[PDB]
């Protein structure tokens with residue numbers, strides 16, 4: 001665990017994310033101008049809550065599938081025992097999706113990428129969960145303020161998954177050793193990119209799963 005050793009891991013995780021990001025940043029950023037029309041928004045609003053759940057759950061599960069593939073090609077993750085792998089994914093994958101979602105959020109007009117175009121939070125009125133949606137938009141807004149780089153998401157979301165303090169882990173030391181190397185990679189990269197400032201500005205680790213309440 002020296003200089004090139006850790007830099008191998010940085011590049012290792014950044015490749016792993018690049019290959020499992022589902023939606024390209026270049027796509028999301030260009031698509032920002034393509035906003036839903038008032039007709040289309042009403043169109044979405046008239047739908048049943050059930051059709052909105054179905055649509056939403058589809059894409060979100062699909063997202064979780066991509067997060068698993070990211071987890072699978074993190075070195076060390078496969079060496080963990082069956083039980084420990086699933087514990088980490090059960091407590092992490094939704095938190096990872098939530099972070100990854102900030103790339104799909106235009107902070108200028110307060111809109112999100114959903115089914116082809118960008119819409120505001122009034123788009124999901126059918127769900128009747130305005131409280132939860134606001135907080136999701138809030139959380140995305142603050143992470144947009146930091147201008148999160150692709151590599152930074154890659155590294156941070158690796159650290160979201162690989163947590164030694166998850167309840168019900170058999171080989172805690174095996175996870176510990178893994179979490180530690182990823183912290184080193186994360187901290188080394190921020191140092192290397194003059195981006196240490198963001199550490200202090202990241203949401204606390206009990207704020208991610210405070211949103212997963214009526215979930």
Ligand SMILES: COc1ccc2c(c1)CCN(C(=O)Cc1cc(=O)[nH]o1)[C@H]2C(=O)Nc1ccc(C(C)(C)C)c(F)c1
Pocket residue numbers: 021022023056057059060062063097100101103104112113114115116124133136
């Ligand atoms: C990087 O993480 C993301 C970000 C957005 C989306 C996804 C994954 C999955 C595909 N998707 C789609 O809309 C489906 C589709 C794919 C494509 O090429 N074109 O369209 C988006 C998405 O699901 N957005 C959405 C935004 C708010 C919500 C909340 C209701 C939680 C606010 C939500 F459930 C989903």
